Amino acid sequence: SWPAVTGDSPHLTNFGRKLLKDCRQVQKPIGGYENLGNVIKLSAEFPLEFGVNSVKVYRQSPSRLARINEEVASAYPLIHERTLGLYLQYLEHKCRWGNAVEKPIYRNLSLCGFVQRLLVKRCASFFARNDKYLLVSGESGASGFEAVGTREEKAPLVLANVLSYDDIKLSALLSVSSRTEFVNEGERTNCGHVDLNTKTLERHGVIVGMIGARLSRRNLMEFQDIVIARQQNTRERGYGMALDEPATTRDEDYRRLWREFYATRDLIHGQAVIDNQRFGPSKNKMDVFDNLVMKRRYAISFDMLLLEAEARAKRVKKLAYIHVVGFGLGVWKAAEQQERIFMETFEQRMRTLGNRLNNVGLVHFSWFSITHCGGLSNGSLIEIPGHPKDGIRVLISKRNPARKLSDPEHAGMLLVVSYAWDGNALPGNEFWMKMLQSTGDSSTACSTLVAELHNPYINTKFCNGGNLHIASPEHGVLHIAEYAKRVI
Ligand SMILES: Nc1ncnc2c1ncn2[C@@H]1O[C@H](COP(=O)(O)OP(=O)(O)OC[C@H]2O[C@H](O)[C@H](O)[C@@H]2O)[C@@H](O)[C@H]1O
């Protein structure tokens, strides 16, 4: 399955060659004892009020502060090695094809500095179809982001202060993961309620932010690569070019970035007729859904989930229990066949990675409408030759994210929780607008420590670009410095 595990070594131009070269000198931040003190103080200095206060560090039991200290040092941003090539190609593309507004931002941007831009320049909240937003600096509003990065952008929505839709398209491929304490079971309606003497709460594990495909904004983000529409998929906008056909405009070079990221052609309207294998229906009757590009986008995210859980479980010498949510299948779902592509691609990447998942024990698909998909069914086993437990258990049922792993079948495993995030929002998203129970994003920030540990304004040492980790199927999960040393 795609992407291939071996035979890789990304091509990289001279431009991306050097920026990855300069990453070999990025010092890996080392954790200590005063990590909690900086988080506690910077959390009090955060200019925005939390949705709930119970997830704050100072309200956790002091006997657990030593473990929370290690959890602060365990946080890092994370991208696929596939995405690393795209980031470097994007920087190169913006360096030459950027307008007068974009060029002062993107040139001389190191790789790690671009990741840092994708972390700090997010809005606090950024949701709904009309783009309701709240910035960390306090400004709020709705809409107005399509102008960001152009000649007629208006403050406070300027490229130097917020992200453009081109940035958000790449930020959707950027994840943040960390060990975490679980404040409550993590049901959607938890709203930060704490039951101090509960008997069913797995209190610590791993939390990983996954971002689905945003498909409802026309001509923007994953719509550009997955939905084949009349207005967008034209020859004048870069669509329909061959592999080595050189791009001579900005639109052609932008489409080249994504043709070569997904390793497939894009399509002009009319070339794609629904065959229900690569081309399926969308919600617009006159559009066409690219089932292949949707699979490859989910494939990238699933590699990050499985390789990250395998690294966390390997460090504590345990087996990973991955609580898998359907990111992009909730309020962001756009095709009825997305969930089938979701689970088909998940099982594909589980078999393709294979022995690279020797420390993954169980995959739990929670809140999915499909109950069986190929080898995936409740209680099934994805056979992997050489696996310590002969394979990976599959469970398909509604489950609270932090429900205690009390069963003897799962006793002592490392609970790895995925949650549906946003590329242009801090952990919780609408959590920062006092909406605590509307999505899995806001429910997670009410039940874990992501609002501080996955916050680049609070956990400044370990949640920055200088701590970027690369999920490579070949080399595992490594810090950006070690990945650069081992591929250059
Ligand atoms: N009550 C529920 N309990 C548990 N899971 C549920 C529930 N209802 C739906 N699900 C499943 O929860 C899963 C995820 O649904 P979502 O949380 O919308 O995620 P997305 O990726 O679609 O939308 C993310 C955007 O919305 C946020 O604001 C972000 O910040 C982004 O802006 C699906 O399988 C649902 O069926």
Short mmCIF file of C-alpha atoms and ligand atoms in Angstrom, two decimals:
data_model
loop_
_atom_site.label_atom_id
_atom_site.label_comp_id
_atom_site.label_asym_id
_atom_site.label_seq_id
_atom_site.Cartn_x
_atom_site.Cartn_y
_atom_site.Cartn_z
CA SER A 1 0.00 0.00 0.00
CA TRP A 2 0.88 3.70 -0.39
CA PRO A 3 3.11 5.19 0.80
CA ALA A 4 5.86 2.60 0.40
CA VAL A 5 7.94 1.81 3.48
CA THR A 6 11.32 1.09 1.87
CA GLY A 7 13.16 2.29 -1.22
CA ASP A 8 12.41 5.84 -0.06
CA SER A 9 15.06 8.51 0.61
CA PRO A 10 12.99 11.53 -0.51
CA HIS A 11 14.39 13.28 -3.58
CA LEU A 12 14.70 16.86 -2.24
CA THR A 13 15.99 19.79 -4.30
CA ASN A 14 19.06 21.82 -3.36
CA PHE A 15 16.76 24.16 -1.42
CA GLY A 16 15.16 21.43 0.69
CA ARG A 17 18.54 19.68 0.84
CA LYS A 18 20.04 22.59 2.77
CA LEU A 19 17.09 23.32 5.05
CA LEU A 20 17.06 19.69 6.19
CA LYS A 21 20.85 19.99 6.50
CA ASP A 22 20.50 22.91 8.92
CA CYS A 23 18.14 20.79 11.04
CA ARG A 24 21.06 18.56 12.09
CA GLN A 25 22.18 21.40 14.39
CA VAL A 26 18.78 21.88 16.07
CA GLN A 27 19.38 20.96 19.71
CA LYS A 28 16.95 18.44 21.20
CA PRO A 29 15.46 20.01 24.36
CA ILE A 30 16.31 17.96 27.45
CA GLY A 31 13.75 17.63 30.23
CA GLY A 32 14.47 18.28 33.89
CA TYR A 33 12.74 19.17 37.17
CA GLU A 34 11.73 22.81 36.65
CA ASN A 35 9.60 21.98 33.62
CA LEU A 36 6.36 22.22 35.59
CA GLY A 37 7.28 25.58 37.13
CA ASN A 38 7.53 27.28 33.74
CA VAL A 39 4.27 25.69 32.57
CA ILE A 40 2.45 26.71 35.76
CA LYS A 41 3.63 30.32 35.55
CA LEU A 42 3.11 30.68 31.79
CA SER A 43 -0.33 29.08 32.12
CA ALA A 44 -1.28 31.84 34.57
CA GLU A 45 0.05 34.45 32.12
CA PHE A 46 -1.98 33.05 29.21
CA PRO A 47 -4.13 35.96 27.98
CA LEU A 48 -7.19 33.76 27.32
CA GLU A 49 -9.44 32.11 29.89
CA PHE A 50 -9.74 28.33 29.85
CA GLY A 51 -13.07 26.72 29.04
CA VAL A 52 -12.74 24.79 32.31
CA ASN A 53 -10.17 25.25 35.06
CA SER A 54 -10.01 21.62 36.26
CA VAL A 55 -7.52 20.67 33.51
CA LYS A 56 -4.97 23.15 34.83
CA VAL A 57 -1.75 21.87 36.35
CA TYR A 58 -2.11 23.59 39.73
CA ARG A 59 -5.41 21.77 40.45
CA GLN A 60 -3.91 18.29 39.95
CA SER A 61 -2.94 16.33 43.04
CA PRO A 62 0.60 17.30 44.16
CA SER A 63 1.61 13.63 44.38
CA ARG A 64 1.18 13.43 40.59
CA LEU A 65 3.15 16.60 39.79
CA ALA A 66 6.34 14.57 39.33
CA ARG A 67 4.68 12.48 36.62
CA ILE A 68 3.09 15.56 35.02
CA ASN A 69 6.59 17.05 34.90
CA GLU A 70 7.77 14.18 32.70
CA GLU A 71 4.62 14.62 30.60
CA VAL A 72 5.57 18.23 29.83
CA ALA A 73 8.91 17.04 28.42
CA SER A 74 7.18 14.30 26.40
CA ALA A 75 5.28 16.73 24.15
CA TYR A 76 6.42 17.35 20.59
CA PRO A 77 4.93 18.31 17.23
CA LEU A 78 4.96 15.49 14.71
CA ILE A 79 4.66 15.08 10.93
CA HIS A 80 5.02 12.25 8.44
CA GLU A 81 8.29 12.03 6.54
CA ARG A 82 6.06 12.41 3.48
CA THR A 83 4.88 15.73 4.92
CA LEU A 84 8.46 16.85 5.58
CA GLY A 85 9.14 16.77 1.85
CA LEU A 86 5.95 18.75 1.24
CA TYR A 87 6.87 21.40 3.82
CA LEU A 88 10.29 21.88 2.19
CA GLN A 89 8.76 22.03 -1.29
CA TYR A 90 6.12 24.47 -0.02
CA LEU A 91 8.77 26.78 1.45
CA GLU A 92 10.61 26.68 -1.88
CA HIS A 93 7.36 27.38 -3.73
CA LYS A 94 6.47 30.34 -1.50
CA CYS A 95 10.02 31.70 -1.76
CA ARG A 96 9.72 32.25 -5.54
CA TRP A 97 5.97 32.34 -6.27
CA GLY A 98 4.88 34.29 -3.20
CA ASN A 99 3.41 37.74 -3.72
CA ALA A 100 4.76 40.91 -2.09
CA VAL A 101 3.03 39.96 1.18
CA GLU A 102 4.13 36.31 1.43
CA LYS A 103 7.81 36.58 0.47
CA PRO A 104 8.93 38.57 3.58
CA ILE A 105 7.45 35.80 5.74
CA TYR A 106 8.56 32.58 4.04
CA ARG A 107 12.12 33.27 2.88
CA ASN A 108 14.93 32.46 5.30
CA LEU A 109 12.32 30.45 7.22
CA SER A 110 14.06 27.37 8.53
CA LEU A 111 12.04 24.15 8.54
CA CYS A 112 11.68 24.29 12.33
CA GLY A 113 10.74 27.97 12.14
CA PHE A 114 7.97 27.13 9.68
CA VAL A 115 6.64 24.49 12.08
CA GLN A 116 6.85 27.13 14.81
CA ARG A 117 4.79 29.45 12.60
CA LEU A 118 2.20 26.69 12.14
CA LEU A 119 2.01 26.40 15.95
CA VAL A 120 2.03 29.97 17.27
CA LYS A 121 0.11 31.74 14.48
CA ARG A 122 -2.93 29.48 14.80
CA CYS A 123 -6.07 31.06 16.11
CA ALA A 124 -7.20 30.05 19.57
CA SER A 125 -10.55 29.01 18.08
CA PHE A 126 -11.37 28.49 14.40
CA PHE A 127 -14.53 26.54 13.60
CA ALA A 128 -17.87 26.52 11.73
CA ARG A 129 -18.41 26.98 7.99
CA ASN A 130 -18.19 30.79 8.18
CA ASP A 131 -14.85 30.60 10.07
CA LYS A 132 -15.67 31.92 13.51
CA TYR A 133 -12.31 32.79 15.04
CA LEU A 134 -10.68 34.08 18.21
CA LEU A 135 -7.01 35.05 18.29
CA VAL A 136 -4.67 34.60 21.24
CA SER A 137 -4.24 38.39 21.29
CA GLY A 138 -7.99 38.74 21.92
CA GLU A 139 -9.40 39.78 18.54
CA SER A 140 -12.49 37.85 17.46
CA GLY A 141 -14.77 37.78 14.46
CA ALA A 142 -15.95 35.59 11.61
CA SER A 143 -14.64 34.98 8.08
CA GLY A 144 -12.00 37.05 6.29
CA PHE A 145 -9.22 34.46 6.02
CA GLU A 146 -9.29 33.98 2.23
CA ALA A 147 -7.67 37.43 1.91
CA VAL A 148 -4.79 36.47 4.23
CA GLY A 149 -1.58 36.25 2.22
CA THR A 150 -2.78 38.47 -0.64
CA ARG A 151 -2.26 42.15 -1.44
CA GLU A 152 -5.60 43.21 0.12
CA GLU A 153 -5.38 41.46 3.47
CA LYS A 154 -6.71 43.45 6.43
CA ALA A 155 -5.43 43.49 9.99
CA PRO A 156 -5.70 41.70 12.34
CA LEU A 157 -5.92 39.02 9.62
CA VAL A 158 -2.47 39.58 8.13
CA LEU A 159 -0.05 36.82 7.16
CA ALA A 160 2.49 37.94 9.77
CA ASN A 161 -0.09 37.44 12.54
CA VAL A 162 -2.34 34.58 11.36
CA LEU A 163 -2.17 31.69 8.91
CA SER A 164 -3.37 31.72 5.33
CA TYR A 165 -5.51 28.91 3.94
CA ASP A 166 -2.35 27.61 2.28
CA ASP A 167 -0.70 27.47 5.71
CA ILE A 168 -3.77 25.83 7.29
CA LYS A 169 -3.67 23.21 4.53
CA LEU A 170 -0.21 22.20 5.75
CA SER A 171 -1.02 22.67 9.43
CA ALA A 172 -3.72 20.01 9.00
CA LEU A 173 -0.85 17.55 8.41
CA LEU A 174 0.92 18.64 11.62
CA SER A 175 0.16 16.76 14.84
CA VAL A 176 1.02 17.28 18.51
CA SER A 177 1.42 14.29 20.83
CA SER A 178 2.38 13.86 24.48
CA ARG A 179 1.98 11.71 27.52
CA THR A 180 -0.88 13.08 29.57
CA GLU A 181 -2.94 12.78 32.71
CA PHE A 182 -6.61 11.97 32.12
CA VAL A 183 -8.82 14.33 34.11
CA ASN A 184 -12.05 12.41 33.46
CA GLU A 185 -13.20 9.58 31.20
CA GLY A 186 -13.34 11.91 28.19
CA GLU A 187 -16.94 11.50 27.06
CA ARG A 188 -18.17 14.37 24.91
CA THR A 189 -20.39 15.79 27.67
CA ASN A 190 -17.72 15.66 30.39
CA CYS A 191 -17.33 19.48 30.46
CA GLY A 192 -14.35 19.26 32.81
CA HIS A 193 -16.24 17.50 35.60
CA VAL A 194 -13.93 15.62 37.97
CA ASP A 195 -15.00 12.56 39.98
CA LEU A 196 -12.17 12.35 42.50
CA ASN A 197 -12.93 8.84 43.77
CA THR A 198 -13.90 7.22 40.48
CA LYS A 199 -13.14 3.56 39.80
CA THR A 200 -13.36 3.51 35.98
CA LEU A 201 -10.82 6.17 34.92
CA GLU A 202 -7.53 5.37 33.25
CA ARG A 203 -5.73 8.43 34.58
CA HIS A 204 -2.60 8.55 32.43
CA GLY A 205 -1.56 7.64 28.89
CA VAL A 206 -0.93 9.36 25.55
CA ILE A 207 -3.04 11.90 23.65
CA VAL A 208 -2.50 12.54 19.93
CA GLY A 209 -4.14 15.28 17.87
CA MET A 210 -5.30 14.11 14.45
CA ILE A 211 -6.79 16.41 11.82
CA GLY A 212 -9.25 15.13 9.24
CA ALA A 213 -9.86 16.53 5.78
CA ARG A 214 -11.80 19.79 5.70
CA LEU A 215 -14.04 19.37 2.68
CA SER A 216 -16.91 21.86 3.09
CA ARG A 217 -15.08 25.07 2.10
CA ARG A 218 -15.15 25.12 -1.69
CA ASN A 219 -11.86 25.61 -3.56
CA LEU A 220 -9.98 25.57 -0.23
CA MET A 221 -7.79 23.00 1.58
CA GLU A 222 -8.48 19.28 0.94
CA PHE A 223 -11.28 20.30 -1.45
CA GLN A 224 -8.48 21.25 -3.86
CA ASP A 225 -7.14 17.68 -4.01
CA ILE A 226 -10.15 15.44 -3.25
CA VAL A 227 -13.20 17.18 -4.73
CA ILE A 228 -13.22 17.57 -8.52
CA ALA A 229 -15.45 20.57 -9.20
CA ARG A 230 -16.43 22.70 -12.18
CA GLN A 231 -15.01 26.08 -11.14
CA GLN A 232 -11.81 24.76 -9.54
CA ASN A 233 -10.51 21.86 -11.65
CA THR A 234 -9.51 23.85 -14.73
CA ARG A 235 -6.37 23.89 -16.85
CA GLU A 236 -5.83 27.60 -16.03
CA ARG A 237 -5.53 26.77 -12.31
CA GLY A 238 -2.78 24.13 -12.68
CA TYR A 239 -4.92 21.02 -12.92
CA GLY A 240 -4.24 18.28 -15.43
CA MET A 241 -0.46 18.42 -15.90
CA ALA A 242 1.95 15.54 -16.35
CA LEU A 243 4.65 14.50 -13.88
CA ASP A 244 7.72 16.17 -15.40
CA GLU A 245 5.71 18.88 -17.16
CA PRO A 246 7.35 22.01 -15.68
CA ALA A 247 5.14 24.62 -14.04
CA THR A 248 5.39 28.17 -15.39
CA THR A 249 2.82 29.94 -13.17
CA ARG A 250 1.99 30.17 -9.47
CA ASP A 251 -1.15 28.05 -9.84
CA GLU A 252 0.70 25.34 -11.77
CA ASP A 253 3.51 25.13 -9.21
CA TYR A 254 1.03 24.99 -6.31
CA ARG A 255 -0.79 22.06 -7.93
CA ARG A 256 2.61 20.45 -8.53
CA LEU A 257 3.29 20.52 -4.78
CA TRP A 258 0.21 18.37 -4.17
CA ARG A 259 0.48 16.15 -7.24
CA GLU A 260 3.93 15.11 -6.03
CA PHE A 261 2.90 14.90 -2.36
CA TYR A 262 0.11 12.42 -3.13
CA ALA A 263 2.23 10.89 -5.94
CA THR A 264 -0.66 11.11 -8.41
CA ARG A 265 -2.08 13.36 -11.10
CA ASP A 266 -4.75 15.95 -10.47
CA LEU A 267 -7.80 16.13 -12.71
CA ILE A 268 -9.58 18.65 -14.91
CA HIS A 269 -13.37 18.75 -14.67
CA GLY A 270 -14.79 16.25 -17.15
CA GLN A 271 -11.84 13.85 -17.04
CA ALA A 272 -13.18 12.19 -13.86
CA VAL A 273 -16.37 10.16 -14.28
CA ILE A 274 -17.67 8.20 -11.30
CA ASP A 275 -16.49 4.58 -11.40
CA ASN A 276 -16.94 3.99 -7.64
CA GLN A 277 -13.32 2.89 -7.18
CA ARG A 278 -11.24 6.08 -7.49
CA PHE A 279 -14.13 8.43 -8.36
CA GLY A 280 -17.15 8.47 -6.07
CA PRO A 281 -20.07 10.78 -5.34
CA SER A 282 -19.90 13.89 -3.16
CA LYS A 283 -22.64 15.98 -1.64
CA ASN A 284 -22.71 18.24 -4.71
CA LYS A 285 -24.36 16.27 -7.50
CA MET A 286 -22.21 17.89 -10.22
CA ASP A 287 -18.89 17.23 -8.44
CA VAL A 288 -16.73 14.11 -8.20
CA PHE A 289 -15.02 12.69 -5.11
CA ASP A 290 -11.44 11.45 -5.47
CA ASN A 291 -11.45 8.25 -3.41
CA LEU A 292 -7.73 7.66 -4.07
CA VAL A 293 -6.48 11.02 -2.78
CA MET A 294 -8.77 10.59 0.23
CA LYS A 295 -7.14 7.22 0.92
CA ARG A 296 -3.63 8.65 0.59
CA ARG A 297 -4.45 11.55 2.92
CA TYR A 298 -5.80 9.14 5.55
CA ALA A 299 -2.81 6.85 4.94
CA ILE A 300 -0.43 9.63 5.99
CA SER A 301 -2.41 10.30 9.17
CA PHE A 302 -2.63 6.60 10.05
CA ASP A 303 1.13 6.11 9.70
CA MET A 304 1.57 8.96 12.19
CA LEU A 305 -0.91 7.38 14.61
CA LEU A 306 0.55 3.88 14.50
CA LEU A 307 4.23 4.88 14.48
CA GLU A 308 3.69 7.39 17.30
CA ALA A 309 1.83 4.89 19.48
CA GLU A 310 4.52 2.31 18.75
CA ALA A 311 7.25 4.68 19.92
CA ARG A 312 5.42 5.69 23.11
CA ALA A 313 4.67 2.08 24.05
CA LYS A 314 8.26 1.08 23.24
CA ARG A 315 9.69 3.67 25.63
CA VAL A 316 7.68 2.35 28.61
CA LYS A 317 8.02 -1.32 27.53
CA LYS A 318 4.28 -1.84 27.10
CA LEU A 319 1.83 -2.58 24.31
CA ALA A 320 -0.19 0.28 22.85
CA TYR A 321 -3.98 0.42 23.17
CA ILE A 322 -4.93 2.93 20.47
CA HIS A 323 -8.32 4.59 20.94
CA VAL A 324 -9.07 5.51 17.32
CA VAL A 325 -11.64 8.19 16.51
CA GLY A 326 -12.96 9.00 13.07
CA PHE A 327 -11.28 12.37 12.56
CA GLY A 328 -12.90 14.09 9.60
CA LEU A 329 -15.95 11.81 9.89
CA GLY A 330 -17.85 13.96 12.41
CA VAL A 331 -18.89 17.51 11.54
CA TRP A 332 -16.38 17.42 8.65
CA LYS A 333 -17.76 14.39 6.80
CA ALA A 334 -18.44 15.10 3.12
CA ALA A 335 -18.85 11.74 1.35
CA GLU A 336 -20.83 8.72 2.49
CA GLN A 337 -17.92 6.43 1.54
CA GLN A 338 -15.33 8.20 3.71
CA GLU A 339 -15.72 5.81 6.65
CA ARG A 340 -15.19 2.77 4.42
CA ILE A 341 -12.05 4.38 2.97
CA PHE A 342 -11.02 5.24 6.54
CA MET A 343 -11.01 1.67 7.86
CA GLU A 344 -9.81 0.08 4.61
CA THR A 345 -6.77 2.38 4.65
CA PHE A 346 -6.19 1.80 8.38
CA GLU A 347 -5.99 -1.99 7.98
CA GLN A 348 -3.83 -1.51 4.88
CA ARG A 349 -1.28 0.59 6.78
CA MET A 350 -1.37 -1.87 9.69
CA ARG A 351 -0.35 -4.73 7.39
CA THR A 352 2.11 -2.63 5.37
CA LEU A 353 3.96 -1.37 8.45
CA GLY A 354 3.86 -4.90 9.88
CA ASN A 355 6.70 -5.73 12.26
CA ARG A 356 7.25 -1.99 12.70
CA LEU A 357 4.17 -2.26 14.97
CA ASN A 358 5.52 -4.99 17.26
CA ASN A 359 4.64 -2.84 20.30
CA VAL A 360 1.07 -2.05 19.20
CA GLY A 361 -1.36 -4.37 20.96
CA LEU A 362 -4.90 -3.27 20.17
CA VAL A 363 -6.69 -0.82 17.87
CA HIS A 364 -10.08 0.34 19.19
CA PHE A 365 -12.33 2.03 16.63
CA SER A 366 -14.78 4.04 18.72
CA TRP A 367 -17.98 5.72 17.48
CA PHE A 368 -17.90 4.23 13.98
CA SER A 369 -21.10 3.32 12.15
CA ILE A 370 -19.58 0.43 10.16
CA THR A 371 -19.22 -2.69 12.31
CA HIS A 372 -17.09 -4.83 9.98
CA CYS A 373 -14.62 -3.87 7.24
CA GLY A 374 -12.48 -6.65 5.81
CA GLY A 375 -10.20 -7.92 8.55
CA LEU A 376 -11.53 -5.24 10.91
CA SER A 377 -14.28 -6.46 13.24
CA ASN A 378 -14.90 -6.52 16.98
CA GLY A 379 -12.50 -9.08 18.42
CA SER A 380 -10.67 -9.72 15.15
CA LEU A 381 -6.91 -10.10 14.76
CA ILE A 382 -4.75 -8.45 12.10
CA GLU A 383 -2.19 -11.23 11.62
CA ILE A 384 1.39 -9.95 11.52
CA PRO A 385 4.14 -12.60 11.26
CA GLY A 386 6.74 -12.04 13.96
CA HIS A 387 4.47 -10.02 16.25
CA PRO A 388 4.90 -10.90 19.96
CA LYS A 389 1.13 -11.42 20.36
CA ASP A 390 0.86 -12.74 16.76
CA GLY A 391 -0.96 -9.58 15.69
CA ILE A 392 -3.15 -6.66 16.74
CA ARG A 393 -6.60 -7.05 18.29
CA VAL A 394 -9.38 -4.95 16.77
CA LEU A 395 -12.29 -3.62 18.84
CA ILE A 396 -15.21 -1.75 17.26
CA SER A 397 -17.61 -0.22 19.80
CA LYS A 398 -18.48 3.06 21.47
CA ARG A 399 -15.98 3.65 24.27
CA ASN A 400 -15.00 6.55 26.49
CA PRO A 401 -11.46 7.67 25.56
CA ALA A 402 -10.05 7.35 29.09
CA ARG A 403 -12.17 4.41 30.27
CA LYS A 404 -9.92 2.34 32.51
CA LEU A 405 -8.25 -0.66 30.87
CA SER A 406 -9.43 -2.94 33.66
CA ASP A 407 -9.96 -6.11 31.61
CA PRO A 408 -7.19 -8.72 32.08
CA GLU A 409 -6.94 -8.92 28.29
CA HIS A 410 -5.73 -5.29 28.24
CA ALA A 411 -4.19 -5.13 31.73
CA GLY A 412 -1.12 -2.90 31.85
CA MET A 413 -1.21 -1.64 28.27
CA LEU A 414 -0.39 1.94 27.30
CA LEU A 415 -3.56 3.83 26.38
CA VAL A 416 -2.93 6.00 23.30
CA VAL A 417 -5.85 8.33 22.54
CA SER A 418 -6.44 10.06 19.22
CA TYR A 419 -8.73 13.07 18.97
CA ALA A 420 -10.09 15.16 16.11
CA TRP A 421 -8.19 18.46 15.94
CA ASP A 422 -7.97 21.51 13.66
CA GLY A 423 -5.02 22.90 11.73
CA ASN A 424 -5.81 26.51 12.66
CA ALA A 425 -6.74 26.17 16.33
CA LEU A 426 -5.16 25.55 19.70
CA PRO A 427 -6.08 22.28 21.45
CA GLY A 428 -9.79 22.48 22.22
CA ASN A 429 -10.65 24.98 19.46
CA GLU A 430 -14.09 26.25 20.51
CA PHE A 431 -13.03 25.26 24.04
CA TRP A 432 -11.59 28.79 24.21
CA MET A 433 -15.03 30.27 23.39
CA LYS A 434 -16.70 28.50 26.35
CA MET A 435 -18.18 25.82 24.05
CA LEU A 436 -17.10 22.71 25.93
CA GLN A 437 -19.20 19.85 24.48
CA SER A 438 -19.71 20.47 20.75
CA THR A 439 -16.87 18.40 19.21
CA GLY A 440 -14.17 15.97 20.26
CA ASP A 441 -11.70 18.86 20.15
CA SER A 442 -13.41 20.79 22.96
CA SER A 443 -14.19 17.60 24.89
CA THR A 444 -10.53 16.54 24.87
CA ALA A 445 -9.30 19.88 26.25
CA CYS A 446 -11.84 19.42 29.06
CA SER A 447 -10.53 15.94 29.93
CA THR A 448 -6.75 16.05 29.36
CA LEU A 449 -3.84 18.48 29.77
CA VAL A 450 -3.57 19.43 26.08
CA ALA A 451 -4.72 23.00 26.78
CA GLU A 452 -1.35 23.51 28.52
CA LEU A 453 0.99 20.76 27.30
CA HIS A 454 0.05 20.96 23.61
CA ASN A 455 -0.04 24.78 23.83
CA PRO A 456 3.00 26.51 22.26
CA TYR A 457 2.35 29.58 24.44
CA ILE A 458 2.48 27.58 27.71
CA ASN A 459 4.67 24.52 27.02
CA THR A 460 7.13 26.68 25.12
CA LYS A 461 10.18 24.43 25.52
CA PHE A 462 8.82 21.16 24.11
CA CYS A 463 5.91 22.37 21.95
CA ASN A 464 7.86 24.32 19.35
CA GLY A 465 9.38 23.62 15.94
CA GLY A 466 12.79 22.97 17.51
CA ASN A 467 11.25 19.82 19.01
CA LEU A 468 9.71 18.57 15.75
CA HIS A 469 9.62 14.78 15.49
CA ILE A 470 9.42 12.94 12.16
CA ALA A 471 7.31 9.80 11.77
CA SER A 472 9.25 7.76 9.21
CA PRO A 473 8.11 4.18 8.46
CA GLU A 474 11.75 3.28 7.81
CA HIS A 475 13.43 5.03 10.75
CA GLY A 476 10.53 5.10 13.21
CA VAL A 477 9.74 8.25 15.19
CA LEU A 478 12.85 10.42 15.55
CA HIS A 479 13.65 13.99 16.47
CA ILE A 480 14.15 16.20 13.41
CA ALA A 481 17.90 16.36 14.12
CA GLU A 482 18.32 12.57 14.06
CA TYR A 483 16.10 12.12 11.02
CA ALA A 484 18.18 14.74 9.20
CA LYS A 485 21.45 13.08 10.23
CA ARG A 486 20.21 9.69 9.01
CA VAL A 487 18.75 10.64 5.61
CA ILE A 488 21.39 13.19 4.49
N1 LIG B 1 -21.16 12.20 21.20
C1 LIG B 1 -20.10 11.67 20.61
N2 LIG B 1 -19.20 10.98 21.35
C2 LIG B 1 -18.13 10.46 20.75
N3 LIG B 1 -17.78 10.50 19.46
C3 LIG B 1 -18.68 11.20 18.75
C4 LIG B 1 -19.83 11.80 19.23
N4 LIG B 1 -20.51 12.42 18.19
C5 LIG B 1 -19.78 12.19 17.13
N5 LIG B 1 -18.66 11.45 17.41
C6 LIG B 1 -17.62 11.02 16.48
O1 LIG B 1 -16.44 11.74 16.74
C7 LIG B 1 -15.60 11.68 15.56
C8 LIG B 1 -14.97 13.04 15.35
O2 LIG B 1 -16.02 14.03 15.14
P1 LIG B 1 -15.63 15.57 15.33
O3 LIG B 1 -15.22 15.81 16.74
O4 LIG B 1 -16.73 16.42 14.76
O5 LIG B 1 -14.34 15.70 14.38
P2 LIG B 1 -14.15 16.10 12.84
O6 LIG B 1 -12.78 15.70 12.42
O7 LIG B 1 -15.31 15.58 12.06
O8 LIG B 1 -14.23 17.71 12.93
C9 LIG B 1 -13.11 18.42 13.50
C10 LIG B 1 -13.40 19.90 13.50
O9 LIG B 1 -14.37 20.19 14.52
C11 LIG B 1 -13.70 20.64 15.71
O10 LIG B 1 -14.10 21.91 16.04
C12 LIG B 1 -12.20 20.63 15.36
O11 LIG B 1 -11.41 21.57 16.06
C13 LIG B 1 -12.22 20.81 13.85
O12 LIG B 1 -12.50 22.15 13.49
C14 LIG B 1 -16.49 11.14 14.43
O13 LIG B 1 -16.23 9.76 14.24
C15 LIG B 1 -17.90 11.32 15.01
O14 LIG B 1 -18.87 10.47 14.43
#
